[PDB]
Amino acid sequence: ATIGRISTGSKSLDKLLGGGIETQAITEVFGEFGSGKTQLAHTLAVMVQLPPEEGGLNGSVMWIDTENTFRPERIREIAQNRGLDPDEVLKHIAYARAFNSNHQMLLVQQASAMMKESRYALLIVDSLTSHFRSEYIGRGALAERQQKLAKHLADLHRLANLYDIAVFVTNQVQGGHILAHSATLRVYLRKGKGGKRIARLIDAPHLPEGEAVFSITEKGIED
């Protein structure tokens, strides 16, 4: 992984992303359940804690959970298989459930208070859209749903830039999922076979089209 970025754990996925995930930016990963999107989030929550030589930023994590995504048992396994102390890794993941889209937005707006006293380098939102989709139903509420989501993405981008944090969010295709303003780096995941998952990058403004295969292992993800 390159200077100032966080390695995903997979050398081929890092290459596809131009050297790993960036701070001061939003990486948005699309896929169905089983595609590896949440496995990648769990892996990043450990990788960011590593020193720069090993692909991290010695940073803490904030995890905003909108649908029971976070598995501390998985973090413990990944940490153990990457030579880290699992209890220390968990102590540096600030977990917060978001009960609705308003609460999800407020959690982001209030997050920087805890960032002056500890060095955070990663904010995960898993998932970005589940509350927005369940709360704003039909054509009569669609414009408001997209405006609210765009405002949330602007808040995340501001936080990312002010505190030098990588923002990593998950999503699902449906064109319900496309916004008028492109606030993120979009990565599309799909499930393969034999432990493999495939990532595709198709419309990045400063990265060419590409694809990468990675594996789900006891180390989280790797080639």
Numbering used by the authors: 108 to 226, 232 to 286, 301 to 349
Paper text:
We focused our attention on human RAD51, an ATP-dependent recombinase crucial for homologous recombination (HR) and for error-free repair of DNA double-strand breaks. We therefore explored the possibility of using a more stable orthologue as a surrogate and focused our efforts on archeal RadA from Pyrococcus furiosus, a protein that was already structurally characterised and is closely related to human RAD51. Here, we describe the complete process of generating robust, RAD51-like surrogate systems from this archeal protein via two distinct approaches: by stepwise mutation of the surface of the RadA to humanise the BRC4 binding area (HumRadA series of mutants) and by generating an archeal/human chimera (ChimRAD51) in which all of the BRC4 binding part of RAD51 is stabilised by parts of RadA.
The structure of HumRadA2 also highlighted the need to introduce further mutations at the back of the Phe pocket (particularly V232Y216) in order to force I169M158 and K221M210 into the same conformation as observed in the HsRAD51:BRC4 complex. Proper humanisation of the Phe pocket also required the removal of an insertion that lies just before V232216 (residues L226–P231). Overall, the structures of the humanised RadA proteins are very similar to each other, and significant differences can only be seen in loops that are involved in either crystal packing, or are mobile and poorly defined.
